[PDB]
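User: Meiosis regulator and mRNA stability factor 1, Mus musculus:
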Amino acid sequence: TLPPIGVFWDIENCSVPSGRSATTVVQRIREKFFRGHREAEFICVCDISKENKEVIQELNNCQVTVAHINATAKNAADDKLRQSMRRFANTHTAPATVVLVSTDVNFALELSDLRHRHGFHIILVHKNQASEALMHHANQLIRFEEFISD
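Assistant: Predicted structure for Meiosis regulator and mRNA stability factor 1:
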């Protein structure tokens, strides 16, 4: 009965600032986007050694996936996010919604393919200074600052 929603969070590009709660970030993502959907993916891709340990602890407690990538590796974070989004597109059929929390222009193709080749609704959560090529593919654009302030 419910369409799937997937969240793909590029933590190194949209990081939780010192002092702020990741639990409240997740809670606000769900409150703002998950109405009338079922969660089918929630993945947060980062090098966990570079992130605040309490942030990682809170994500673990939120029961979402913290996919660790050694940052010495290349485009390996971008690859993990692309892989997870392609897997979502191969698993689900429209109607479906994807929330990408990133600023990185290297996801433009993905956003386009998921929107047009799969018919998915695209939500881009981005910090200021986001790639306009990336922004053009989203159905709705939201500033990441809404999730990390009061």
